[PDB]
Amino acid sequence: QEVDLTNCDREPIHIPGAIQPHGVLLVLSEPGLVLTHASENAPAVLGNSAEQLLGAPLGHFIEPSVREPLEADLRSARLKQLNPLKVVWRVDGVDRFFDGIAHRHQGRLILELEPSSHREAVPFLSFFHAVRDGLSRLRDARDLQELCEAVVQEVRGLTGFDRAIIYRFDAEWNGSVIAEARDARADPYLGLHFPASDIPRQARELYQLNWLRIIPTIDYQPARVRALPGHGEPLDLSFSVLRSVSPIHLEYLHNMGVQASMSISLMKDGKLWGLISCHQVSGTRYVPYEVRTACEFLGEVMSSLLAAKEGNEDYDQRIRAKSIHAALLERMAREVDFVSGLASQESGLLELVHAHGAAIHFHGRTTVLGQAPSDEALTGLIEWLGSRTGEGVFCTDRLAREYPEAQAFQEVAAGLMAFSMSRGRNNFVLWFRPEAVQTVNWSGNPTKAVEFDQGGPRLHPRKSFELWKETVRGRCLPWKAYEVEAASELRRSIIDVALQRSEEL
Amino acid sequence: QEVDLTNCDREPIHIPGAIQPHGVLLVLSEPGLVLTHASENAPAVLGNSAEQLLGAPLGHFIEPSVREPLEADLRSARLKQLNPLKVVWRVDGVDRFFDGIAHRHQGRLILELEPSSHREAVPFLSFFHAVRDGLSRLRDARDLQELCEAVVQEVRGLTGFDRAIIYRFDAEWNGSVIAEARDARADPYLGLHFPASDIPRQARELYQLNWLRIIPTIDYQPARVRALPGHGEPLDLSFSVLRSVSPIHLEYLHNMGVQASMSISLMKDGKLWGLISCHQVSGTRYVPYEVRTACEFLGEVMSSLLAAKEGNEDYDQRIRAKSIHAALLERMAREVDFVSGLASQESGLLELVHAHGAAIHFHGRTTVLGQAPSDEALTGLIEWLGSRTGEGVFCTDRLAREYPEAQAFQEVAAGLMAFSMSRGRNNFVLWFRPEAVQTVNWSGNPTKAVEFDQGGPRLHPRKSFELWKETVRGRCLPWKAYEVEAASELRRSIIDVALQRSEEL
Ligand SMILES: */C=C\C1=C(C)C(=O)N/C1=C\c1[nH]c(Cc2[nH]c(/C=C3\NC(=O)C(C=C)=C3C)c(C)c2CCC(=O)O)c(CCC(=O)O)c1C
Ligand SMILES: */C=C\C1=C(C)C(=O)N/C1=C\c1[nH]c(Cc2[nH]c(/C=C3\NC(=O)C(C=C)=C3C)c(C)c2CCC(=O)O)c(CCC(=O)O)c1C
Known about the structure:
2 copies of one chain form a homodimer. Chain A is α+β, with helices and mostly antiparallel strands. The first copy, chain A, has 3 domains: about 1-10 and about 125-220 and about 245-315 and about 435-475, 2-Layer Sandwich (Beta-Lactamase), CATH 3.30.450.40; about 10-125 and about 220-245, 2-Layer Sandwich (Beta-Lactamase), CATH 3.30.450; about 315-435 and about 475-505, Beta-Lactamase (2-Layer Sandwich). In chain A, about 30% of the residues lie in helices and about 25% in strands. Chain A is built from 14 helices and 22 strands. Chain A has helices at about 40-45, 50-55, 65-75, 125-140, 145-160, 200-210, 245-255, 290-310, 320-330, 340-345, 345-350, 380-385, 400, 480-505; strands spanning about 20, 25-30, 35-40, 85-90, 95-105, 110-115, 165-170, 175-180, 195, 210-215, 225, 260-270, 270-280, 355-360, 365-370, 395, 415-420, 430, 440-445, 450, 460, 465-470. Chain A has a 7-stranded antiparallel β-sheet with strand order 1-11-3-2-6-5-4, with helices on one face. A 6-stranded antiparallel β-sheet of chain A has the order 9-8-7-13-12-10. In chain A, helix 9 (about 320-330) runs parallel beside helix 14. Chain A is elongated, with a radius of gyration of 29 Å. At the A-B interface, helix 4, helix 8 and helix 14 of A face helix 4, helix 8 and helix 15 of B. Bound molecules: the ligand */C=C\C1=C(C)C(=O)N/C1=C\c1[nH]c(Cc2[nH]c(/C=C3\NC(=O)C(C=C)=C3C)c(C)c2CCC(=O)O)c(CCC(=O)O)c1C (2 copies). Chains A, B: In the N-terminal section; belongs to the phytochrome family. Chains A, B: This is histidine kinase. Chains A, B: Its EC number is 2.7.13.3. Chains A, B: Keywords: Chromophore, Kinase, Phosphoprotein, Photoreceptor protein, Receptor, Sensory transduction, Transferase.
């Protein structure tokens, strides 16, 4: 079944029927540009009832000389490049002005309007340095930590947020604030780890598709979006800038001492790698669209630069694991008994994967070798592998995750990377790896990252985000990239020499 | 010695002692202050004669308010993240504005001054949107062809050049134009080839380190970099944007019929993989530095994606290969004699790498499937050793090159995709491709270019650039890398079942 969701990971955050009400969301028939949905905050923002708007066509509302460029663009298929649209809305005789942000999703033409006149606004000059020098900084970064600290310093400067951090996910979707720029007010989260549940699975998948979100104030009544009959099905809002956010995450931000936020998905190889997260500890922050997408852009630049700087690499060992491998291959090549030819290679075989223990099961007939004992316990380990898959190279940093019968062993302090030699799948190779104990600095108590109501099943976020030092056992140090090719390569060589052996009969 | 350099790889293009006169090059003593070199075109660009500039501090000519922010910047360690410098030059009592491009090379601090236009909100927004729309368009590129396509369209859109092409180097450092954006006006260079003497080694070694060069006009007068007594030794100008370029290359551009030029290096795996190259056919192109580097950054993103996007080339052919593989790995299951399992789907094994012939030598006997060399195919079956396989897949379209006897049968196998199955190297799988006449469109006879003066001992580039077809003989259609890959995966699949068979008997 693979994975494996929980109570958070089920909420449907993409169709709440409601938008954040500092702006107005509409959807327009194509090609009529007739309004089928409007949001009930329309009189507060545009000066019209919802009633008035529905079934009416957009051109009726717009000051007559900007009808042509707006309508032309709304039917353009190159629209995502055209945001923001200049929107002048005329009631009676007087004008108001909006950032129009149009998009299409699941066959709907959605248009959101952000009041753009009486504005926060940012001077062009710091908008100019943030994207021009921003670009220059990320390009000149010498390592990942310069890349990160350039991003947050630049986002903070351009937004004037109280806090801005780089948040990096891990293989289990825990996260960790690995860089930060802040005003002295806000408490520093630099160093903290957060549970994978602060950004649950449906959120995470959304932010892989939509890369930009802002909550300008966490205190608002949602504006319901009306529609006229024939469109009662809840409208998809994945890509709506104004979508109402999961109110329990509003609760979360409350307990985190933060009154506004903005985040930006960071992407590597197509999956979510981390966030740019920004916080205002007190005060709303209604950041104009233009400033946001400049922030999104520094995001997309930093993402694309990950590999070319996160690849500070490890430019040896690889070469020598290649050289260790050559050695093990040449020795196996030469004994008629190559299982005993690899077990005579205790140090070359342990050091290939940086394992501190190994075991070889073949025609019977286990031969342990390193220091990871089990032996009585290991016969249950090995053809537990024999059951439902251990193909190709099995690899884990916490064997007590997949086979918690290891909890009682030395644990994944006797740490496993394995495979089978023949696909008749009963000849195995194991590797074992000692513990890394590691103190880990958590925000609040991960044990209890979620609270429950009265007497009530509804969930709530933790009230405490203060440093809480867990110590972690089971886990050892990560199996690096180069360690699992080395394992498949040695698998490839066992297969070759076995095949050569039998060609010799 | 490797290369082996005809009559061009001498001319130290890095020390010409002259620049392109649309800008002014300066050299600055350090710590701070005082001008040791300066180009003679100062008065025409800048106001002052070099005689007045030389020996004096930079401040003396900088408008006083601008003076300290700028000399704080010229003292930074990483000037790169500050370019362009805002240089406000006060002459008489009028302020002329320049882009200050600063760097250090060989303990010498070099300030080039290019005339600047003062930025303004609206045209910056459109530029920023273009760079940002270019950046994502490359990330969303399906394959190399598309990556190349988006790149040339995006560079042209920013620079307004008449032609932007992707020039791709092959193995002898010849070239090919593999994609092009252009004003249909200009004659289309798409598909042409250009000999490696057009970009000599010390040019490419230069461009391996400096990824951006522009010649805003070919017809121009090298303003010489004059200096102070005690500084008269050649100035290393390898990283200067104004460094006057080798004058034989300007006649090349003249002869080629190009008035202005811009090129950007492309880097795969540390080595020069190609250029982005741009021309103006008549008229000039003084591209501002901000736009120039934004093009360079798209080049850096393109470099960063070459492997990934090329790895997804022919992404239907791959589907079709993988299901042919799948098909072959099953029909080898119902037969203990896997060899004839591959001889039933001889049409499948032949379509797997698009060959018209194949051969399996297994346990001393050879099975022939398509059109093959004569039954003396003991031919290249015995002959081999150094390279040859060793392992894994041997792949050529010039089998007459390495293995000369095949000239007799290039009508049926001028190309050879082959591997061995075991370390004993008695068993092989061979695929054949016939000769294909093939014609290669050069850019005027590439036998010349290695050209002399009167013929006095001077060098000179070709005169005609008309399509000059070469009819290459003795090759098959080139072997695609998804085909080489398909042979790799079959080869180890054949191993896996070669074991499993013998292994259990
Ligand atoms: C199971 C319920 C939840 C618990 C318990 C919890 O803690 N979060 C739950 C659900 C939830 N979270 C979000 C959105 C979200 N969460 C974060 C988390 C962090 N912000 C930070 O700054 C840090 C560390 C520095 C962490 C960790 C973030 C950034 C976001 C995105 C919104 C934002 O920027 O504030 C959602 C979805 C909200 C939505 O998209 O509607 C849910 C359901
Ligand atoms: C023996 C000397 C030379 C012969 C013969 C010749 O043909 N060129 C010689 C010297 C030379 N060229 C350059 C720089 C250079 N050349 C090119 C070539 C091309 N531009 C195109 O668009 C195409 C085809 C599509 C080709 C081929 C390019 C791109 C460059 C880079 C400069 C530019 O973009 O205009 C040099 C070095 C000059 C210098 O860097 O100072 C030399 C010595």
